[PDB]
Design an enzyme around this catalytic site. Structure first.
Site, PDB file in Angstrom:
ATOM      1  N   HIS A   1       0.820  -1.219   0.000  1.00  0.00           N
ATOM      2  CA  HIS A   1       0.000   0.000   0.000  1.00  0.00           C
ATOM      3  C   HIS A   1       0.866   1.288   0.000  1.00  0.00           C
ATOM      4  O   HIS A   1       0.310   2.394  -0.018  1.00  0.00           O
ATOM      5  CB  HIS A   1      -1.074   0.002   1.115  1.00  0.00           C
TER       6      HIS A   1
ATOM      7  N   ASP B   1       0.285  -7.886   1.786  1.00  0.00           N
ATOM      8  CA  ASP B   1       0.666  -6.482   1.731  1.00  0.00           C
ATOM      9  C   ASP B   1       2.194  -6.356   1.796  1.00  0.00           C
ATOM     10  O   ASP B   1       2.764  -5.987   2.836  1.00  0.00           O
ATOM     11  CB  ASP B   1      -0.046  -5.699   2.857  1.00  0.00           C
TER      12      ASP B   1
ATOM     13  N   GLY C   1       1.935   6.308   8.344  1.00  0.00           N
ATOM     14  CA  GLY C   1       3.323   6.734   8.134  1.00  0.00           C
ATOM     15  C   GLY C   1       4.361   5.713   8.571  1.00  0.00           C
ATOM     16  O   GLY C   1       5.514   5.788   8.124  1.00  0.00           O
TER      17      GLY C   1
ATOM     18  N   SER D   1       3.760   2.510   8.049  1.00  0.00           N
ATOM     19  CA  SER D   1       3.513   1.469   7.033  1.00  0.00           C
ATOM     20  C   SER D   1       4.777   0.994   6.358  1.00  0.00           C
ATOM     21  O   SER D   1       5.597   1.824   5.948  1.00  0.00           O
ATOM     22  CB  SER D   1       2.590   2.025   5.948  1.00  0.00           C
ATOM     23  N   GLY D   2       4.924  -0.325   6.222  1.00  0.00           N
ATOM     24  CA  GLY D   2       6.085  -0.900   5.554  1.00  0.00           C
ATOM     25  C   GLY D   2       7.355  -0.975   6.385  1.00  0.00           C
ATOM     26  O   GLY D   2       8.312  -1.622   5.975  1.00  0.00           O
TER      27      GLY D   2
HETATM   28  N1  LIG Z   1      -2.893   0.727  14.071  1.00  0.00           N
HETATM   29  C1  LIG Z   1      -1.983   0.235  13.217  1.00  0.00           C
HETATM   30  N2  LIG Z   1      -1.211  -0.727  13.624  1.00  0.00           N
HETATM   31  C2  LIG Z   1      -1.869   0.789  11.860  1.00  0.00           C
HETATM   32  C3  LIG Z   1      -0.591   0.804  11.286  1.00  0.00           C
HETATM   33  C4  LIG Z   1      -0.376   1.294  10.009  1.00  0.00           C
HETATM   34  C5  LIG Z   1      -1.422   1.851   9.286  1.00  0.00           C
HETATM   35  N3  LIG Z   1      -1.187   2.376   8.026  1.00  0.00           N
HETATM   36  C6  LIG Z   1      -2.211   2.999   7.206  1.00  0.00           C
HETATM   37  C7  LIG Z   1      -2.770   2.034   6.212  1.00  0.00           C
HETATM   38  N4  LIG Z   1      -2.662   0.694   6.294  1.00  0.00           N
HETATM   39  C8  LIG Z   1      -3.264   0.219   5.165  1.00  0.00           C
HETATM   40  C9  LIG Z   1      -3.690   1.271   4.389  1.00  0.00           C
HETATM   41  C10 LIG Z   1      -4.373   1.269   3.082  1.00  0.00           C
HETATM   42  C11 LIG Z   1      -4.436   0.102   2.313  1.00  0.00           C
HETATM   43  C12 LIG Z   1      -5.081   0.102   1.082  1.00  0.00           C
HETATM   44  C13 LIG Z   1      -5.703   1.245   0.622  1.00  0.00           C
HETATM   45  C14 LIG Z   1      -5.665   2.402   1.383  1.00  0.00           C
HETATM   46  C15 LIG Z   1      -5.015   2.413   2.613  1.00  0.00           C
HETATM   47  N5  LIG Z   1      -3.369   2.421   5.064  1.00  0.00           N
HETATM   48  C16 LIG Z   1      -2.714   1.832   9.824  1.00  0.00           C
HETATM   49  C17 LIG Z   1      -2.925   1.356  11.116  1.00  0.00           C
HETATM   50  O1  LIG Z   1      -4.168   1.366  11.719  1.00  0.00           O
HETATM   51  C18 LIG Z   1      -5.331   1.743  10.954  1.00  0.00           C
HETATM   52  C19 LIG Z   1      -5.325   3.216  10.657  1.00  0.00           C
HETATM   53  C20 LIG Z   1      -5.795   3.711   9.445  1.00  0.00           C
HETATM   54  C21 LIG Z   1      -5.709   5.066   9.172  1.00  0.00           C
HETATM   55  C22 LIG Z   1      -5.130   5.889  10.117  1.00  0.00           C
HETATM   56  N6  LIG Z   1      -4.658   5.443  11.291  1.00  0.00           N
HETATM   57  C23 LIG Z   1      -4.763   4.129  11.532  1.00  0.00           C
END
Ligand SMILES: N=C(N)c1ccc(NCc2ncc(-c3ccccc3)[nH]2)cc1OCc1cccnc1
Length: 223
Positions: free
Chosen positions: A41, A85, A174, A176-177
């Site tokens: 992603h 992912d 942020g 992510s990855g």
């Molecule tokens: N709580 C966590 N451990 C967590 C860690 C990382 C992320 N990354 C954001 C993210 N992951 C996947 C996508 C994505 C995939 C496909 C299409 C569009 C988007 N975006 C999010 C997380 O928790 C949810 C979350 C969402 C948004 C704002 N905050 C937390």
């Protein structure tokens, strides 16, 4: 990363910062001088990889910047469910290794015995801001049964769960990855989790890296 603190400057030589459009997009893990692993992603145009960074707001003598010449998303990645992912990024410039730039070995055993885990990144902190200094937190793997209960019908064999029962230390937007490091090996990649970020009951969900040994090796060795 929420409820953590600044990393020790020498503890994260495998951490990458991925940029697009001039700002921080994702974390990533250096796994070979020519390759960085991240979440699928995180695929965006003109990705710029930064290695040897600690503070994003300052120019650091140890930093190295590289364009990406190839972005290899897992063929079975499913954006809707976050299944598989994972993405490989080939660097334009092989990483010039130093004490602050080093690859991290992959966990190849899916039945690896429990070791001390940690997460890190420049993702959103508890105050809702994006920190200049990389954040770190110790977390523990959560049983597959407990995670299935936390997210019914959402957890595949390609996912691992990890969290912190005491403060809810978690990865966030942020991060992510970025890496889930267990026993000095890459165990997972930051993928998804709870919104807002916090892991007390709904643990963070990580790409299960041990499942991708063959695909990673085949991609790196290709052509
Ligand atoms: N709580 C966590 N451990 C967590 C860690 C990382 C992320 N990354 C954001 C993210 N992951 C996947 C996508 C994505 C995939 C496909 C299409 C569009 C988007 N975006 C999010 C997380 O928790 C949810 C979350 C969402 C948004 C704002 N905050 C937390």
């Amino acid at each position: 990363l929420v409820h953590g603190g600044p990393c020790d400057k020498t503890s994260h030589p495998y951490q990458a910062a991925l940029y697009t459009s001039g700002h921080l997009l994702c974390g990533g893990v250096l796994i070979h001088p020519l390759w960085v692993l991240t979440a699928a992603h995180c695929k965006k145009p003109n990705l710029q990889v930064f290695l040897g960074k600690h503070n994003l707001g300052q120019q650091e003598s140890s930093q190295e910047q590289s364009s990406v010449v190839r972005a290899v998303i897992h063929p079975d990645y499913d954006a809707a469910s976050h299944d598989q992912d994972i993405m490989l990024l080939r660097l334009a410039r092989p990483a010039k290794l130093s004490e602050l730039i080093q690859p991290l070995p992959l966990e190849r055993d899916c039945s690896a015995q429990t070791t001390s885990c940690h997460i890190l990144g420049w993702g959103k902190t508890a105050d809702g801001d994006f920190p200049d200094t990389i954040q770190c937190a110790y977390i523990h793997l959560v049983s597959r049964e407990e995670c299935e209960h936390a997210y019914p019908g959402q957890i595949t064999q390609n996912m691992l769960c990890a969290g912190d029962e005491k403060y809810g230390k978690d990865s966030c937007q942020g991060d992510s990855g970025g890496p889930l490091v267990c026993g000095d090996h890459l165990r997972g990649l930051v993928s998804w989790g709870n919104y807002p970020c916090g892991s007390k009951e709904k643990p963070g969900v990580y790409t299960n890296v041990c499942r991708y040994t063959n695909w990673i090796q085949k991609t790196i060795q290709a052509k």
